């Protein structure tokens, strides 16, 4: 079930919310924003459904882990954080169990190497980065910014999700 469920309506909703949930100064770290350079060239592959289970799940996953801690709620509004991370929790759980299960279609570890690799590198460098900075007020900011950019990009592969007339 690797369909544009949260990419159609969740795109704007998540975008706006996630945008108002992050309160910081863009000038707080101009020498940190640049990071997590995800190779959209090789990672750009949303034409496959059973192949998006890894990339998709991985994305919402890394977010759940980070939002699964108190550090996240301690960095930004708790209310927004709760409802936010909450939606993703049930999202990944359902979405994943949707494609993951044999009810639909599965993927092979052959192509999953790249997908899993890219996604892994992103989340890895993300958590690792902020982890080295001691979850400082600057790290969280950088991670967030990239999260939005990468998110929008990953979702903007075909640009045919849902005609927003
Ligand atoms: C998807 O992966 C599973 C892994 O066990 C099976 O190999 C399955 O054969 C693959 N694709 C389908 C649904 O035929």
């Amino acid at each position: 079930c690797d369909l544009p469920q949260t990419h159609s309506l969740g795109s704007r909703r998540t975008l706006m919310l996630l945008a108002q949930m992050r309160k910081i100064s863009l000038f707080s770290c101009l020498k940190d924003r640049h990071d997590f350079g995800f190779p959209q060239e090789e990672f750009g592959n949303q034409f496959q459904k059973a192949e998006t289970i890894p990339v998709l799940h991985e994305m919402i996953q890394q977010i759940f882990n980070l939002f699964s801690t108190k550090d996240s709620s301690a960095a930004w509004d708790e209310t927004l954080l709760d409802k936010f991370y909450t939606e993703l929790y049930q999202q990944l759980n359902d979405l994943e169990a949707c494609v993951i299960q044999g009810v639909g279609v599965t993927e092979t570890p052959l192509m999953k190497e790249d997908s899993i690799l890219a996604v892994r590198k992103y989340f890895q460098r993300i958590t690792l980065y902020l982890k080295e900075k001691k979850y400082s007020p600057c790290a969280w900011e950088v991670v967030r910014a990239e999260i939005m950019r990468s998110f929008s990009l990953s979702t903007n592969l075909q640009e045919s999700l849902r005609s927003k007339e």
Side-chain angles (χ1 to χ4, degrees), residues 8-9 12 159-165:
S8 284
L9 94 164
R12 181 172 166 186
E159 204 179 315
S160 182
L161 308 148
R162 192 274 216 76
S163 154
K164 315 197 93 208
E165 303 269 5

Side-chain angles (χ1 to χ4, degrees), residues 104-108:
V105 55
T106 62
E107 31 61 52
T108 57

